[PDB]
Amino acid sequence: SSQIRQNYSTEVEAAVNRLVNLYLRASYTYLSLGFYFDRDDVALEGVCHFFRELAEEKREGAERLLKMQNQRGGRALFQDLQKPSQDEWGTTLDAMKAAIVLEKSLNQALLDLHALGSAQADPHLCDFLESHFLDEEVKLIKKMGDHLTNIQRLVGSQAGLGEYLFEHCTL
Amino acid sequence: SSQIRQNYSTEVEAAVNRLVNLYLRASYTYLSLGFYFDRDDVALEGVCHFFRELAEEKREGAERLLKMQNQRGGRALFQDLQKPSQDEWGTTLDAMKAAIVLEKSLNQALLDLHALGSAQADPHLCDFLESHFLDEEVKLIKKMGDHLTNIQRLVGSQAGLGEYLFEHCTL
Amino acid sequence: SSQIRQNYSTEVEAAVNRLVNLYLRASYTYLSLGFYFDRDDVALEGVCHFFRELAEEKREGAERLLKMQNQRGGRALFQDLQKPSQDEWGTTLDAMKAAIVLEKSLNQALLDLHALGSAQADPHLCDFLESHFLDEEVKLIKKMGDHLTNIQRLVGSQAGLGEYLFEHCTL
Amino acid sequence: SSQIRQNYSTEVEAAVNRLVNLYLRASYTYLSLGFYFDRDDVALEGVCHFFRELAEEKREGAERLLKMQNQRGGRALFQDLQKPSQDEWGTTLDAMKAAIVLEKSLNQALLDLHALGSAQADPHLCDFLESHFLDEEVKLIKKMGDHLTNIQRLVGSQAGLGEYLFEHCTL
Amino acid sequence: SSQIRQNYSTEVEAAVNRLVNLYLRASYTYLSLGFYFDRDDVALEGVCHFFRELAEEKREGAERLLKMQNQRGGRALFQDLQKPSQDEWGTTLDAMKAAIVLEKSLNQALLDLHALGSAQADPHLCDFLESHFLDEEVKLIKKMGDHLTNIQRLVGSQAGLGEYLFEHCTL
Ligand SMILES: [Au+]
Ligand SMILES: [Au+]
Ligand SMILES: [Au+]
Ligand SMILES: [Au+]
Ligand SMILES: [Au+]
Ligand SMILES: [Au+]
Ligand SMILES: [Au+]
Ligand SMILES: [Au+]
Ligand SMILES: [Au+]
Ligand SMILES: [Au+]
Ligand SMILES: [Au+]
Ligand SMILES: [Au+]
Ligand SMILES: [Au+]
Ligand SMILES: [Au+]
Ligand SMILES: [Au+]
Ligand SMILES: [Au+]
Ligand SMILES: [Au+]
Ligand SMILES: [Au+]
Ligand SMILES: [Au+]
Ligand SMILES: [Au+]
Ligand SMILES: [Au+]
Ligand SMILES: [Au+]
Ligand SMILES: [Au+]
Ligand SMILES: [Au+]
Ligand SMILES: [Au+]
Ligand SMILES: [Au+]
Ligand SMILES: [Au+]
Ligand SMILES: [Au+]
Ligand SMILES: [Au+]
Ligand SMILES: [Au+]
Ligand SMILES: [Au+]
Ligand SMILES: [Au+]
Ligand SMILES: [Au+]
Ligand SMILES: [Au+]
Ligand SMILES: [Au+]
Ligand SMILES: [Au+]
Ligand SMILES: [Au+]
Ligand SMILES: [Au+]
Ligand SMILES: [Au+]
Ligand SMILES: [Au+]
């Protein structure tokens, strides 16, 4: 509230609420991804667990943003959460590509908020994004790109399968 | 006997004896499955161990039913145990499909006994089935459906093999 | 009270209070049983302890019912507790037979409450009885029937005494 | 299969399958014995436990034979398992006599298989029976004969009961 | 020597020396197998280790026979050790087939010595072979037959590879 609020624009407050919505939508997407891979007719438990852990990470991201909104004296406002873009997610390849697209969209929202913070001369906001969000997204996206390459290699060819097994079983 | 027996119909007592027979038949089927996969010309030790553990689970199920029959004051009666439906069990795929068919048949007998208990207004019976049988069967059948999917994926294609290896070796 | 009460009929509330009365009456009966076997002219300390432990079990049963009555928003009402049916309890055989009759009467009250719960479509009540009462009564009644048989065998004959000693001292 | 099988006659393979059937039948007999002594109107828990442990021993015997059949390259074949000879087992005396008769029948089958092994010049078979079966049966039969004597002594007379108590309580 | 020697025929003494030669030849064969799989252009270290452990087992077998020859008062005589049948061993499949052929030849020599012992009425010899050789050979041959099946399955087809991976990676 107005008792503590200092150098915290209405533009940033609003964008923070919208980012919270995006992270919770992402978390819901990952919940859907996770339970799809849990289906008896899909049955890739490691993929289910990968996506379910991401759902938790995304929710934790929204919660840190909400805590920050209150620390700055803004008002947390919650919007409807849109259901995920698909009801069935295809193969592991299709799923990881959708995951990367999703993370890139969050990453772009983080950068757009960083840009707003910079235009509003709000260094606390930039510091907050730097310390808790930007590097984490870069690391996750790298890990997903890695996974995508390995899925493609494995599902593509027996040269691919061969190189994977040597790396994973011998090295 | 008649000293303790209360609210325990002759219909339920009989059906309990028949269920015991079905669980021991299932256990014998799994013993046969297990030793088939132990053959030098089949030699899938993990499959042998999976089926042998199920044989133990099924016997434990029959033993809990027998203990319950005595706790309610009914008379345990034993019938001939029919030998398993096959002498050789084919591939891992063929075996897991036969296992699922078998479990579904036990599950249906459990539900038919639950229905009888309900028509006989025997809440202790329902509670007993709920606490020790229905959820266990659902979980086992899910695990078998999972296994079936993974066997099908692995024996089907190099996309399938690829996705399996990524899940199992990378995630 | 009316702040929490949901799907909890007046019929069930009343029957719960009456069941509480029956369990406390049973507990009082067992207290009397216990101290009878403590008399210097009876002096069967193990029987005294068996009955005194049952008095505690029955009181604990009434207390769980009272806690449940409050959790559902009903009003615990207490009635006079009738004294036990006898002032002296005869032999161990006479006492264990009276105990079994007593437990069967509680068991029947539990089943009658289960029936009412079912007619009132109160699944929480059924679950509560299933999880804390029905199986416990069945197990206790079985144990009492066992004890009755062994008392009868021991007080009956030297074949009986003989078989008991072999079971208890050799096996 | 034929890849490993060496010096293992079809006569021995068949007799091994039949012995497996006999040990599983014995195990089923002991399961029936055990639950009979568990009845509320019989209620000799130590006898129930004695017979139930024997059911496990007999099943373990059949399992070792099945493992050996596969180690030698023979084919495990399973037959119907006949239900036990009685539905009710009488007294402890009647039960232990039936147990001894049963063990003697297994012992004779072991000796008949040893004889066949010897006529087929199969030293591995003889060694297997020597190391896992013959001595175990002799020890069990001795223990049962001991038990029979003590049951007879106890159920017979007060000289008998007296000598038992001195042995068991003083020595 | 003649100071201790009792019931130990010259026929058995000679055959024991010849069996020692066969076990040392087998050990030398396995040494060759092991170092072949160690070649940089073969490079299957687990196979190298399997065969090298068998070379040690075979040498230990010859050493137990030599110790027994002295315990019975016979004279250990050593003969030239023929080099292995091949200088290069082909694939893992070719190698395991040659290993099984080799073990079957030792097994047959053990049985032929057992037969001689029996014709010479030498029960100590039979006991020695029973306790240290016959069962060990049966177990090893079974394990090799198992390995052969799995190699064949793996090198044969992607159904085969698939079933192997499910067994080994999921179960
Ligand atoms: Au899952
Ligand atoms: Au998961
Ligand atoms: Au800034
Ligand atoms: Au920034
Ligand atoms: Au900055
Ligand atoms: Au590996
Ligand atoms: Au790997
Ligand atoms: Au691997
Ligand atoms: Au096995
Ligand atoms: Au196994
Ligand atoms: Au019911
Ligand atoms: Au039910
Ligand atoms: Au129910
Ligand atoms: Au792996
Ligand atoms: Au794996
Ligand atoms: Au792996
Ligand atoms: Au007392
Ligand atoms: Au007491
Ligand atoms: Au209900
Ligand atoms: Au109920
Ligand atoms: Au219910
Ligand atoms: Au004793
Ligand atoms: Au005793
Ligand atoms: Au005693
Ligand atoms: Au029992
Ligand atoms: Au028992
Ligand atoms: Au023999
Ligand atoms: Au023999
Ligand atoms: Au022998
Ligand atoms: Au004693
Ligand atoms: Au005693
Ligand atoms: Au005693
Ligand atoms: Au090496
Ligand atoms: Au090596
Ligand atoms: Au001999
Ligand atoms: Au021999
Ligand atoms: Au022998
Ligand atoms: Au694996
Ligand atoms: Au594996
Ligand atoms: Au693996």
XYZ file of N, CA and C in Angstrom, chain B residues 8 13 15 41 51 105 143 153:
24
model
N -23.285 -62.746 8.344
C -22.380 -63.284 7.322
C -23.118 -64.350 6.525
N -20.054 -66.372 2.121
C -19.101 -67.409 2.493
C -18.657 -68.204 1.242
N -18.829 -67.387 -1.917
C -18.194 -66.598 -2.964
C -16.755 -66.312 -2.547
N 16.428 -70.762 -22.839
C 16.107 -70.379 -24.209
C 15.111 -69.220 -24.234
N 7.054 -61.810 -12.477
C 5.950 -62.767 -12.366
C 6.036 -63.551 -11.046
N -9.781 -60.209 -14.700
C -10.739 -61.235 -14.298
C -10.805 -61.307 -12.773
N -0.049 -50.340 -13.543
C 1.354 -50.680 -13.754
C 1.529 -51.651 -14.927
N 6.022 -50.166 -27.393
C 6.823 -49.076 -27.941
C 8.216 -49.613 -28.314
